Write a protein that binds this ligand. Structure first.
Ligand SMILES: Nc1nc2c(ncn2[C@@H]2O[C@@H]3COP(=O)(O)O[C@H]4[C@@H](O)[C@H](n5cnc6c(=O)[nH]c(N)nc65)O[C@@H]4COP(=O)(O)O[C@H]3[C@H]2O)c(=O)[nH]1
Ligand SMILES: Nc1nc2c(ncn2[C@@H]2O[C@@H]3COP(=O)(O)O[C@H]4[C@@H](O)[C@H](n5cnc6c(=O)[nH]c(N)nc65)O[C@@H]4COP(=O)(O)O[C@H]3[C@H]2O)c(=O)[nH]1
Length: 166
């Protein structure tokens, strides 16, 4: 019964469990210094999508996003549903430049997608933020903060894009 750890709608890890994994990777880094990156991404114009096509359509968009993610990342990477339309991925042994590759592959897969819903045929995009862990963040939440900041820049910078935290 691994139901305590997963999000019902997407099947991905839930926020609580995913964060525990982020914290575990953070401490592993503090000890060993391996390249490791974090991704935080959101579905673009979600509210508008939800308002326009209905919440059921929105759920399908969320489920498809999770499916694209699940089928596009390594079993050693860890994806989680952080919030309503927000997702996160832990990418161990992966530096910033390498993270951009998997992120772009996901971005493109989503961009080329068509969510066949009962309300209509939808096309959407995602904004993504990447933050490779450095010695600066003093706890895992400050690491998450850097990725979230990169995500905001991606959204404000045009959306349907990947931004790496500098
Ligand atoms: N373009 C690209 N896509 C990536 C990359 N890493 C992961 N993916 C995608 O995400 C899935 C990851 O599978 P996995 O759990 O690592 O499990 C993988 C993997 O562990 C193993 N495998 C396949 N090719 C390689 C490889 O070139 N090197 C290693 N070490 N293992 C491989 O077999 C499974 C095959 O999975 P897939 O059907 O290919 O499905 C793959 C793959 O299409 C990547 O570096 N580049
Ligand atoms: N954590 C994580 N990192 C990722 C992922 N996708 C890409 N990267 C990083 O970014 C580089 C992407 O290389 P690529 O152009 O996809 O070119 C890749 C890829 O196309 C192929 N390859 C490796 N593994 C797989 C695989 O599992 N499935 C498939 N289909 N191809 C693979 O060989 C090349 C191996 O590249 P790398 O030396 O591993 O270096 C990789 C990898 O370390 C991912 O899903 N998760």
């Amino acid at each position: 019964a691994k139901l305590s750890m997963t999000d019902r709608l997407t099947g991905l890890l839930n926020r609580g469990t995913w964060e525990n994994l982020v914290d575990a990777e953070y401490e592993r880094f503090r000890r060993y210094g391996q390249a490791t990156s974090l991704v935080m991404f959101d579905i673009d114009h979600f509210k508008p999508v939800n308002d326009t096509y209905g919440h059921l359509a929105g759920d399908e968009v969320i489920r498809h996003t999770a499916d694209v993610t699940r089928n596009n990342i390594r079993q050693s990477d860890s994806a989680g549903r952080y919030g309503g339309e927000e997702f996160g991925i832990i990418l161990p042994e992966t530096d910033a430049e390498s993270a951009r590759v998997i992120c772009e592959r996901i971005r493109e897969a989503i961009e080329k997608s068509t969510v066949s819903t009962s309300a209509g045929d939808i096309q959407y995009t995602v904004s993504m933020g990447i933050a490779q862990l450095t010695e600066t963040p003093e706890n895992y939440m400050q690491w998450m903060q850097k990725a979230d900041e990169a995500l905001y820049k991606a959204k404000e910078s045009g959306r349907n894009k990947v931004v790496v935290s500098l």
